[PDB]
Amino acid sequence: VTGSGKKPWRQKGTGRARSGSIKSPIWRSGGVTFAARPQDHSQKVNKKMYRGALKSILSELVRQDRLIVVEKFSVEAPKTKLLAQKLKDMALEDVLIITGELDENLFLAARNLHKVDVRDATGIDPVSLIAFDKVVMTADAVKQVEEMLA
Amino acid sequence: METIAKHRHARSSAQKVRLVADLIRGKKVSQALDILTYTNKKAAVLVKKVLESAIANAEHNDGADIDDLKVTKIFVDEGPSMKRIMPRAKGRADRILKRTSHITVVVSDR
């Protein structure tokens, strides 16, 4: 705290309480007693625990019928209108679309829709796999997920 | 028909004014004005000027005859206290309080 390290009054003689510092955390505009620091909240997860969790929740999306597998999912031109038409034809609103390839027109046509997210097969995460209502996998992305996850 | 008059921020203590205000509660206004005329307190000058304002407001703004009027409610509230520092001996300072008031006179027939 910006201040001075001088006693605001003497130790004794006055009728007031003992005090040693104006920066005291019991004063107005004093310090915080346990002031925080920039700390890292990252946890370690073991690799076999991360894969056990992904293999668990992909089994649960199968058992809950929240997983859709198609051969191909392409958009001709990078238009969100085309993507919304295709997802309306698929009867999908809240969806994660994981594709084993890099589709730029699909990334651009899905970038503005908050209901829709598009991932690479490497970039899948459990919290997205839960936060989205349906998950659409390319069959190649299935082959890659099965290969990473043994 | 009730008619209100207020002297907010009356530069006087509320305790000193309530002595005067307790004399005319429930009285006819001709009697209250004679009491305030021959009362020697400063608060009688204040509360008389307020009672005269309440009478003139009842006659002008509300259409009421003065002889039937009667002081039904009167009360003095504590106002904001401006505060001054008065120096004392041996370097000690005292903070005097300079009280204010809010005089309120409600006058009516009933």
Binding site: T14 | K90, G91
Partner: peptide, 27 residues
């Protein structure tokens, strides 16, 4: 002078080193 007024408590206890009206020190 609202500065002096804000800070008056600091010094109305100006000298406060005086007392000892007990000549019989209780010794």
């Amino acid at each position: 002078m609202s500065g002096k007024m804000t800070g008056i408590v600091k010094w109305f206890n100006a000298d406060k080193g005086f007392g000892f009206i007990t000549p019989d020190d209780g010794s």
